[PDB]
Amino acid sequence: TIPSEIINWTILNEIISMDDDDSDFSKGLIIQFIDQAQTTFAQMQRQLDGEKNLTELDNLGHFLKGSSAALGLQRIAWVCERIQNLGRKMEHFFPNKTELVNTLSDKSIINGINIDEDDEEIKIQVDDKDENSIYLILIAKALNQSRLEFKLARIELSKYYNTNL
Hints:
Blueprint: H1 9-17, H2 25-49, H3 54-70, H4 74-87, H5 97-101, H6 133-161
Helix pairs in contact: 2-3, 2-6, 3-4, 4-6
Keywords: Cytoplasm, Nucleus, Phosphoprotein, Two-component regulatory system
Subcellular location: Cytoplasm; Nucleus
GO molecular function: histidine phosphotransfer kinase activity; protein histidine kinase binding; transferase activity, transferring phosphorus-containing groups
């Protein structure tokens, strides 16, 4: 089950302690993650729209799962594990946006935003001859969830650091 909190404070507080003798330490880590995440989402999108290679989608997901987990962005890590697992054909289902957002502990973070704003259209035609169709479409869905979870994390990190991240 997807964690309810966007940020795992147990983890992030530990990274933040190390800001005492290095002011920009944690913040530099986040800014670096923000950049890597945007590049990975674009590459995942390019796969879905181009060669549709599940192995690369696996590597991409795996990679982002690591970065995000280290920083305590647990909901992003969870969706990345879904992408990895379904690109590896080990999973066959991905929940709807409505179920996933209902898991938030503080639903107020979603009050002024449009949950589908960052959505990309699923341009995969169901092809019952391509054994990879359903997985590609499920990954397309998970990618859309990742994008929302990424936005939610930036909103939270922004209020903590007090600046647009």
